[PDB]
Design a protein around this ligand. Structure first.
Ligand SMILES: [Pb+2]
Ligand SMILES: [Pb+2]
Ligand SMILES: [Pb+2]
Ligand SMILES: [Pb+2]
Ligand SMILES: [Pb+2]
Ligand SMILES: [Pb+2]
Lengths: 328, 328, 133, 328
C-alpha cells in the first residue's frame, strides 16, 4: 500500500530555530521595530471657501469638503480622541479665483489661510501641515506656472511656490509640504523661509518621492512607477536641499521605496501617505468582503512603520484614534 | 489687491535637474531596472482528484479546480501564448485520503503526481514547480505532523516533508517550493534530494518569507507582519541551507521585504507571489471602478520587478501573456 | 577545587534548570551567568525537550562589572568594549532570540554596539538597582 | 527526592571561550581601547569679576567662583599635580555690565580676558580653552541676540559670537569652544579667525552635541534628548564647517551619542563633558552610600574613553590628578 515515507534527518541546527522569538502574542509587539501610536497619524483636511460647506467627496471615501464654520465640530471630537496633526488642502469654489499664476493661493482670505488661523486659535494644540501646490489654484489646473502652450516654466513656478510657502508660515502654519516635483523647489522654499526668518520654526516636509499611478484618481513632473534610481536621486537631493522630513506616496504600492528612503534619509523622519486610491481600494474590497477593513488597515499601516516610516498621512485617522485605544 | 508674490531665486543648480532622464515614454523603459517579460510569469494550478473537474473557486477569482482530463485544453492556449511555468497545488476530494501524516501527499496516483506526469508528456516545454506542504493532505489540515493536542512535531513533519519533495522530483517535477515555515526544512529537503542524486536537477524554490495577514483567506509557524528582523534571519537561513531561489509572500504588501531579500539574497533569483487576497482585491476594486484592473495590474506587478523580483507567481498570468504582446 | 568555576558542569546544570522552568510554564529564560557557551547548551536542551519553539532565549550577552549592583566568576571589564562585541556576536549565533545589556545608563554606547551587531534581535535595556537607587 | 538534573553537553566550542582574554588584572588594561592619563583631563574655571572672589557654588559641587587674585594659588597645586588644561567661564558680578548684546563679553577688562592673560604669564605651560556664549553676558540671559519679544536673531547673534571668539584668541587663548547651538556658528567663527590670521593657532572645539535635560540645573536652540538623527546631522555639519574637535554633553547619559560621534567624526578628537548635574549626582549618591565615589568616577570616566572620547571636561579633575598617580 502507498505508505508515508519519512526521510532520515540530522539533529536540528540551533541556527534553524527562530521560532521561539515570535510565539506569544506579546512577542509580536517585541518583534516590531516600531509600534503604531496616535501622535503618528496625520489627518488631511479639504477646507472649502464656502464657510458653511461640508460636502462629502467620494470614490469610496468618508472624507469631505468642510468650511471654516463647520470646522470646530469636525475637529473637536477627533482632537479629544487625541489627534495631533492635520494637513490642509484648500478648495476655492468661488466663481472667479483661479488663474495663470495661482494668485489666490496665498490669499489671506482663502480656505487654507482662513483655516490656518482658525486652528491656531480654537485648537492651539494641533500641529499644522500645509500642502504647497498651485494645482488647485490655476485655471489650467497644472502644477506650476506654464510656458507657451506647453510645459511648466520651472523658475517662475518655483519663484511662485516659495512665495506661498512663506506666506502660509507667516500665517501661522507649522509645516509646509510642497507637492510639486518641480526640480529644486526645496532649496528655494528653504531660502525664502530663511530670508523671512522663519526657517527655525517651519518644518519642511517634502514630497521627495511622488510617483504616478491609478491610485490618486481613476483612469507635469511625476516619477515613473519603475524609476527606482530617480526616486533615490530625488530623495538624496531634497535632503541636501534642506528637507527636514520626507513623504513617500503612494504608500502600500511603494513600500520598497519607503525602504530606500529609510536608508538614504536615515536621520530624517520618513512619512507614509495612504493615497485616496488605496484608501478607496481597501474600502471597496471590504464591502465586497474580500478582507476585513480593520484587519487590512493595521496590516497595511504597520507595513508603513515596518518599511521605514514613523509618521502617516491617512484618511483612516478617525478610525485609528478609536482602535488604538483598545485592548481586550 | 492681493497680488501674486514671487520670491527671488538663484540660478538652477545642475544637481536639481533630474527631469531630462524621464521625459519621453521610452525613457520610462530606460529607467526600469528590469522589464516585465513572459518567461517571468508563473501560473498556479489546482489539480483536483476528479479527472473531469473544472470547478470555479472564488472570492473574486477566475481560477479553478481542474482535473487531469480537462488539463490539455486549459494549458494548451496559454502555452501557445508563451507560458513557461506553472506551480502545482493538488486538491484531493476523494472521501478517504486525508490523515495524521498526509500519507496521500506523494501518492503516485494523486492529482499532483498525476499532473506532473501529464505535463512532462503533453507539454514537455513547460517548467514544473510543485508546492510542498502537508496542509491539504492532513485531517486536521495543519501544516505539519502534530504532537498531542497541540503543536507541530518539527522533526517528524520535516522528515515527512523532505520525503514528498523527493517523491515529486522522482516523478518528474523540475522545482519544489516548500510552503511550510517549519524551521530547517530546506537543509533536510536539500539533503534528501542529494541522497536521491536529484540535487543537480531540482531547483529549490523556498518560501523564505511567508507572513500572516487577511490576504490569503478572509477573517502553525507563520511570521508576524511586523517582524522585519525575523524575515531577514529566515532569508539568510534558507540561503545558507541550500535555497536556489526565494519566494516572498504576500507581495504588494511586502514590497519592502522584497527589497531586503534583494540585498540579502543578492545572487539568488527573487520570486514575488501575488496572493489570492491581493488578486481578489484588485478585481473587486476594479469592478467598483476604483481603478482600472489592467492599469493596477502592471503598476503592482512592475513594483515586484522594481522592488527586487525577477519572477512572479500570479493569477493574472492568463491576462499578461496577452497584454505583453501589445504595442500601440 | 578551591578555585574557579567548572564550566561544563555549571553549564550542564544551567541548561537543566532552564528547561525545567520552561516545562513549568515560563515563556522566557534569561541566563545571567556569563559562563562561556551557555546559550548553545540551553538552546539544545530546549530543543531536545521540544520547547525551543515556545521559549524565548533572552540572553545577558553584555553583563559588565561595576559599583552599580551592590556597593563596594566571569564578568566583563567595564573597558573591554571588544569583548562585549565578540560576546554579543557569539550569543547571537548560538541561538539568542534577544539580548540584554546591563547595566544600562552607564553602557549606552555598548547598547549602541548591540543595535548594530544584533540588528535583527530585540535589544533589552536593564536599569540595575544601583542606577535605580 | 528532588535531585539536580544535568543535561548532556557537547565539547566546548573554541569560539565560546573568550574568557582567557580578560582573566588577569593586567589584561583589563590590555582590553581597554584607551587608558585614562592626566593630559586628558580638562578643568573648568569660573573666573569672577571681583578680583578677590572665591565663592563656593553648589548643588553638590566643590567648585567655585574664583577671582584673578586668588587664581595663582588655586591653579598652582593642580598644575604641579600635572594639570594640562582649563576651560574658562567668566562671571561678571558688577552691577552694570549685562545687556542687549552681551557687549561686555569680549571686554578687555573682564574676568575671562583678564584670566586668559593671567594664565599665559603665571602658567605659560597650561592650555587655554574658552567657552564662547552670550548666555552670561546678556540681560535676558538668552544664548544669542534676540528679536522682538521672541526668538534669537540668528545672523546677529552669530555675527556677535564670532566677534568674541576672535577677541579671546587675540587675547591669548589657545582654544574657543562655542556653546551656542545656533546654526552655522562654526563656519562663521572659523572665517573670523581666518580673516584675523588666527586660524592656524586656535583650536575650534565645538559643542556639536548639546542636549537638554535635568542635568545642568534642576527643574534657545537645544537638541531633544531623543533626537538621535539631529545629533548626527549637527556633528556632520560642524565637522565640515571647520570644527577641529567635538564636545558631547552631557556625557554619561549620552554615551551612545559619544559612540556616533566616534564613527562620524572619526579623525577628530572627541571630548566628553561631565555636566555639573552628573557630577552633583555621583556625589549625592556617594554621600547616601549608594556607591563609592572613586569607584563610580573611574567607571563613569572610562566609559567616556570606551565610548569614544580621548579628552574629558570634568570637575573631578582635582581628584583624578591624584588618583592617576597611584599604584598599589
Ligand atoms: Pb499638485
Ligand atoms: Pb493637479
Ligand atoms: Pb501550508
Ligand atoms: Pb493550511
Ligand atoms: Pb549658553
Ligand atoms: Pb543660559
Amino acid at each position: 500500500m502507498h505508505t508515508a515515507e519519512f526521510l532520515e534527518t540530522e539533529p536540528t541546527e540551533i541556527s534553524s530555530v527562530l521560532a521561539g522569538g515570535y510565539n506569544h502574542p506579546l512577542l509580536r509587539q517585541w518583534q516590531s521595530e516600531r509600534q503604531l501610536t496616535k501622535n503618528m497619524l496625520i489627518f488631511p483636511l479639504f477646507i472649502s471657501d464656502n464657510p458653511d460647506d461640508f460636502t462629502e467627496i467620494d470614490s469610496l471615501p468618508n472624507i469631505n469638503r468642510i468650511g471654516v464654520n463647520r470646522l470646530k465640530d469636525y475637529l473637536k471630537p477627533l482632537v479629544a480622541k487625541g489627534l495631533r496633526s492635520v494637513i490642509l488642502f484648500g478648495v476655492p469654489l468661488i466663481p472667479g479665483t483661479k488663474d495663470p499664476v495661482g494668485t489666490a493661493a496665498d490669499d489671506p482670505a482663502g480656505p487654507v489661510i482662513q483655516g490656518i488661523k482658525f486652528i491656531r486659535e480654537y485648537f492651539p494644540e494641533l500641529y499644522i501641515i500645509c500642502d504647497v501646490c498651485l494645482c488647485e489654484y490655476t485655471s489650467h489646473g497644472h502644477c506650476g506656472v506654464l510656458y507657451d502652450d506647453g510645459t511648466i516654466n520651472r523658475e517662475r513656478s518655483v519663484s511662485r511656490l516659495a512665495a506661498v510657502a512663506v506666506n502660509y508660515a507667516k500665517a501661522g502654519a507649522h509645516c509646509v509640504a510642497p507637492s510639486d516635483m518641480i526640480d529644486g523647489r526645496i532649496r528655494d522654499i528653504k531660502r525664502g523661509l530663511i530670508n523671512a526668518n522663519l526657517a527655525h520654526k517651519t518644518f519642511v516636509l517634502s514630497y521627495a518621492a511622488k510617483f504616478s499611478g491609478n491610485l490618486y484618481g481613476p483612469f507635469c513632473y511625476q516619477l515613473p512607477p519603475a524609476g527606482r534610481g530617480l526616486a533615490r536621486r530625488a530623495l538624496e537631493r531634497d535632503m541636501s536641499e534642506g528637507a527636514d522630513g520626507i513623504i513617500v506616496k503612494p504608500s502600500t504600492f511603494y513600500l520598497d521605496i519607503m525602504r530606500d528612503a529609510s536608508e538614504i534619509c536615515k536621520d530624517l523622519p520618513i512619512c507614509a501617505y495612504h493615497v485616496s486610491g488605496e484608501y478607496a481600494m481597501l474600502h471597496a474590497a471590504a464591502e465586497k468582503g474580500v478582507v476585513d477593513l480593520k484587519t487590512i488597515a493595521f496590516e497595511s499601516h504597520q507595513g508603513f512603520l515596518r518599511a521605514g516610516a514613523r509618521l502617516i498621512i491617512t484618511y483612516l485617522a478617525p478610525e485609528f484614534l478609536d482602535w488604538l485605544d483598545e485592548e481586550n
